[PDB]
Amino acid sequence: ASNFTQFVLVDNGGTGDVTVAPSNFANGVAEWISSNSRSQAYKVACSVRQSSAQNRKYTIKVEVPKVATQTVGGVELPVAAWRSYLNMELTIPIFATNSDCELIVKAMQGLLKDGNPIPSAIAANSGIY
Amino acid sequence: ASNFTQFVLVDNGGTGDVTVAPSNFANGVAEWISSNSRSQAYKVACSVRQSSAQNRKYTIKVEVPKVATQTVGGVELPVAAWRSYLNMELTIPIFATNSDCELIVKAMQGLLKDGNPIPSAIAANSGIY
Amino acid sequence: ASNFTQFVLVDNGGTGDVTVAPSNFANGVAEWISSNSRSQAYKVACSVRQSSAQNRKYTIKVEVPKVATQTVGGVELPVAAWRSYLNMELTIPIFATNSDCELIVKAMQGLLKDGNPIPSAIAANSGIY
Amino acid sequence: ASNFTQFVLVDNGGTGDVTVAPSNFANGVAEWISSNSRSQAYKVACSVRQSSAQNRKYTIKVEVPKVATQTVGGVELPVAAWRSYLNMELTIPIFATNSDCELIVKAMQGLLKDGNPIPSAIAANSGIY
Amino acid sequence: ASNFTQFVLVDNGGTGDVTVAPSNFANGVAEWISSNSRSQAYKVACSVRQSSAQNRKYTIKVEVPKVATQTVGGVELPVAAWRSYLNMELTIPIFATNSDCELIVKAMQGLLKDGNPIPSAIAANSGIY
Amino acid sequence: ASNFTQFVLVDNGGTGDVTVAPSNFANGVAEWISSNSRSQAYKVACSVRQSSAQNRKYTIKVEVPKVATQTVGGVELPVAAWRSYLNMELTIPIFATNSDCELIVKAMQGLLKDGNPIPSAIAANSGIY
């Protein structure tokens, strides 16, 4: 094993899928980036720390860029028009069993599943109502 | 539309699924909880707001109960030993079209898909290695 | 669902029943008022907050007006001679199950049921003896 | 009359009803408790007094035990995790006739009638939405 | 019940209609935004407040954008070339019955009905003459 | 040609309609007043002005009276028991073509169309919920 492997971040059904690969583990922060210039890359970062004596906290960050080509000084450079940022922190008690943890993972998957309230609001630029 | 509806948070295959239903809307913050006491409930909250001149921010909070050795309806202390807390913040530039937003949703779904590093680490009480 | 619906506050047996309808949810305070000028309306307000870390507190307020017509400046205005105010605060531990909560609701109904001590004292302008 | 009598606080249909009986009258405050230890009892207290020159005020307090997972006759700590507290204050202007007062009683009964928003929110561990 | 819902702001007869959906109800200010880029979206905000002892005051705001694409350095962004701003304040004494309010609403709709002086001056970049 | 004419402010379907007729156009402020006592009359005022270099600003005002008779010392006078005041300001950049203006007018009519959130809250003495 080694769970530090590449995965497809954006599944565009085989064509134009955005895959992200391991790229750095310096300072205990596991990082993954897509095959682009570092200026236009998708980026995922993950780190876990025993925050309290009885908790562990995972900090996960994703950056989704809007790619563009910009003319600076009469020269064109690969750039990102803007970036969207996802920041998540998960605190799990040390008393959580593996099956307790699987429950947290399933809850996070159901939350974002297609057609459920939240992913629907986000995708439509609206709130919950 | 009208997305404030009940949904399946934990999909256990039809048998033993955890459904979460609307429970509060005070202050534009939509809340959903499972059919349990509030100390043992699965809880989801969501709200959007223009965080700055250039961004909108979605704050999503989830609480998941530690189920192994749980006593249904009992008084379980300390509260912190029996609950996991998820905190997500999604910042999206005001230029993001619905399409851009659909892609951000896919990135979140890919991140947590089964078999991918992050959800596998969490489920196994591990970090990256 | 949406429990924010209209209900009959004073059941005068089909004729002259006082019904109250949703009228505002600003600041997380659910409000209901009767179809009158705002000066002569019945008013119900409800809000819940996690008062302590282990409690939740519901604050409910009802205002029953005594309607009158008053001549101010030689002009008649719809007015309330006086108002009676009900103020209730219910503190429920987070460890309370739904069935535990149903017990609280039944207790509150029995308390005010016709012929029981309290509603009898109130209706007769006396104390308990 | 003489209203200080035993009554059914929780009506469970004849089987498993909670009856509450007079238990104290120190200081003009009528008290009723169920047949349990004082830590697990259903308790009701009531008193009236002229709060001001223009009003009389009824203070009614109710305590309801958390029953799910309860150990009858046992020592259950912390006390706050096992009890709900109701606090009602009814202010009535000195001009209110018996009829006016009967109407105030009906308003209180309508507020808590089954199926109405408030009692439904409470029973479901919810707020308004 | 809820009136914080989606609605048609610009009726372009079934197609090309501008719909505005609820987005956020923070601090007593209900806000609605149309879909797609927040930068090119229409916006409606509304709030009510007791302006004085006898008055309640509504504050409505609407923004109509002039959709355009901004190109800078070869990077183009969806923007509003400019915006038209409507700010209205409606004061209503607490003596107004529902019938009085309905009349106030009719006066507002009549003021803007097609063919009347005001909507015709505006639609033609003109004043009164 | 002239748009400074009489028009129906409150359409009560042919009968009981409130018509407002031109009264005075002094200092760039066009004013319309309904017939009979000026004290019980409806009033509409409108003016446009170049608010800045790029903007033109319309200022519309409407007054809805609550008709009543004042009696003092046996002398009765026709008065308005009170008035409801509407003050609106519409800013439009000088780049707006007639098509843009027509759209702005449609947005205003849609905002107040029957059944939509805003006109329904007002007509019912309510806020958003």
Coordinates of N, CA, C and O in Angstrom, one line a residue, chain C residues 32-79:
Chain C
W32 N -46.4 35.0 13.8 CA -47.7 34.7 13.3 C -48.6 35.8 13.8 O -48.5 36.2 15.0
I33 N -49.5 36.4 13.0 CA -50.4 37.4 13.5 C -51.8 37.2 12.9 O -51.9 36.4 11.9
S34 N -52.8 37.7 13.5 CA -54.2 37.5 13.0 C -54.5 38.6 11.9 O -53.8 39.7 11.9
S35 N -55.5 38.4 11.1 CA -55.9 39.4 10.1 C -56.5 40.7 10.6 O -57.7 40.8 10.6
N36 N -55.7 41.5 11.2 CA -56.2 42.8 11.7 C -55.2 43.8 11.4 O -54.2 43.4 10.8
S37 N -55.5 45.0 11.8 CA -54.5 46.1 11.7 C -53.5 45.6 12.7 O -53.9 44.8 13.6
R38 N -52.3 45.9 12.4 CA -51.2 45.5 13.3 C -51.4 46.0 14.8 O -50.9 45.5 15.7
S39 N -52.3 47.0 14.9 CA -52.6 47.6 16.3 C -53.5 46.7 17.1 O -53.5 46.7 18.3
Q40 N -54.4 46.0 16.4 CA -55.4 45.1 17.1 C -55.1 43.6 16.9 O -56.0 42.8 17.2
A41 N -54.0 43.2 16.4 CA -53.7 41.8 16.1 C -53.2 40.9 17.2 O -52.5 41.4 18.1
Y42 N -53.6 39.7 17.2 CA -53.1 38.7 18.1 C -51.8 38.4 17.5 O -51.5 38.5 16.3
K43 N -50.8 38.0 18.4 CA -49.5 37.8 17.9 C -48.8 36.6 18.6 O -49.0 36.5 19.8
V44 N -48.2 35.7 17.8 CA -47.5 34.6 18.4 C -46.1 34.6 17.9 O -45.9 34.9 16.7
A45 N -45.1 34.4 18.7 CA -43.7 34.4 18.3 C -43.0 33.2 18.9 O -43.3 32.8 20.1
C46 N -42.1 32.6 18.2 CA -41.4 31.4 18.6 C -40.0 31.4 18.1 O -39.7 31.8 17.0
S47 N -39.0 31.0 19.0 CA -37.6 30.9 18.6 C -37.0 29.9 19.5 O -37.4 29.7 20.6
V48 N -36.0 29.2 18.9 CA -35.2 28.2 19.7 C -33.8 28.5 19.6 O -33.3 28.9 18.5
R49 N -33.0 28.3 20.7 CA -31.6 28.6 20.6 C -30.9 27.6 21.5 O -31.5 27.1 22.4
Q50 N -29.7 27.2 21.1 CA -28.9 26.3 22.0 C -28.3 27.1 23.1 O -27.2 27.6 23.0
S51 N -29.2 27.3 24.1 CA -28.8 28.2 25.2 C -27.5 27.7 25.9 O -26.5 28.5 26.0
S52 N -27.4 26.5 26.4 CA -26.1 26.1 26.9 C -25.5 25.2 25.9 O -26.0 25.1 24.7
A53 N -24.5 24.4 26.3 CA -23.9 23.5 25.4 C -24.8 22.2 25.4 O -24.8 21.5 24.4
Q54 N -25.4 22.0 26.5 CA -26.3 20.8 26.7 C -27.8 21.1 26.8 O -28.5 20.2 27.1
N55 N -28.2 22.3 26.4 CA -29.6 22.6 26.4 C -30.0 23.3 25.2 O -29.2 23.9 24.5
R56 N -31.3 23.4 25.0 CA -31.9 24.1 23.9 C -33.1 24.8 24.6 O -33.7 24.2 25.5
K57 N -33.3 26.0 24.2 CA -34.4 26.7 24.9 C -35.3 27.4 23.9 O -34.9 28.0 22.9
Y58 N -36.6 27.1 24.0 CA -37.6 27.6 23.1 C -38.2 28.8 23.9 O -38.6 28.7 25.0
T59 N -38.4 29.9 23.2 CA -39.0 31.0 23.8 C -40.3 31.3 23.0 O -40.2 31.5 21.8
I60 N -41.5 31.2 23.7 CA -42.7 31.4 23.0 C -43.5 32.6 23.6 O -43.5 32.7 24.9
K61 N -44.0 33.5 22.8 CA -44.8 34.6 23.3 C -46.1 34.8 22.6 O -46.1 34.7 21.4
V62 N -47.1 35.0 23.3 CA -48.5 35.2 22.7 C -49.0 36.5 23.3 O -48.7 36.9 24.4
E63 N -49.7 37.3 22.5 CA -50.3 38.6 22.9 C -51.8 38.5 22.5 O -52.1 38.3 21.3
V64 N -52.7 38.6 23.5 CA -54.1 38.6 23.3 C -54.6 40.1 23.5 O -54.4 40.6 24.6
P65 N -55.1 40.7 22.4 CA -55.6 42.1 22.6 C -57.0 42.2 22.9 O -57.9 41.4 22.6
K66 N -57.4 43.3 23.6 CA -58.8 43.7 23.9 C -59.0 44.8 22.9 O -58.5 45.9 23.1
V67 N -59.7 44.5 21.8 CA -60.0 45.5 20.8 C -61.0 46.7 21.2 O -62.0 46.5 21.9
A68 N -60.6 47.8 20.7 CA -61.5 49.0 20.9 C -61.2 50.0 19.8 O -60.4 49.8 18.9
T69 N -62.1 51.0 19.7 CA -62.0 52.1 18.8 C -61.8 53.3 19.6 O -62.6 53.7 20.5
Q70 N -60.7 54.0 19.3 CA -60.4 55.2 20.1 C -60.4 56.5 19.3 O -59.9 56.5 18.1
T71 N -61.0 57.5 19.9 CA -61.1 58.8 19.2 C -59.9 59.6 19.6 O -59.8 60.1 20.7
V72 N -58.9 59.8 18.7 CA -57.7 60.6 18.9 C -57.8 61.7 17.9 O -58.0 61.5 16.7
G73 N -57.7 63.0 18.5 CA -57.8 64.2 17.6 C -59.1 64.3 16.9 O -59.1 64.7 15.7
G74 N -60.2 63.8 17.5 CA -61.5 63.9 16.8 C -61.6 62.9 15.7 O -62.6 62.9 15.0
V75 N -60.6 61.9 15.6 CA -60.6 60.9 14.6 C -60.6 59.4 15.3 O -60.0 59.2 16.3
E76 N -61.3 58.5 14.7 CA -61.4 57.2 15.2 C -60.3 56.2 14.6 O -60.3 56.0 13.4
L77 N -59.6 55.5 15.5 CA -58.6 54.6 15.1 C -58.8 53.2 15.8 O -59.2 53.1 16.9
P78 N -58.5 52.2 15.0 CA -58.6 50.8 15.5 C -57.5 50.7 16.5 O -56.3 51.0 16.2
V79 N -57.8 50.2 17.7 CA -56.8 50.2 18.7 C -57.1 49.0 19.7 O -58.0 48.2 19.5

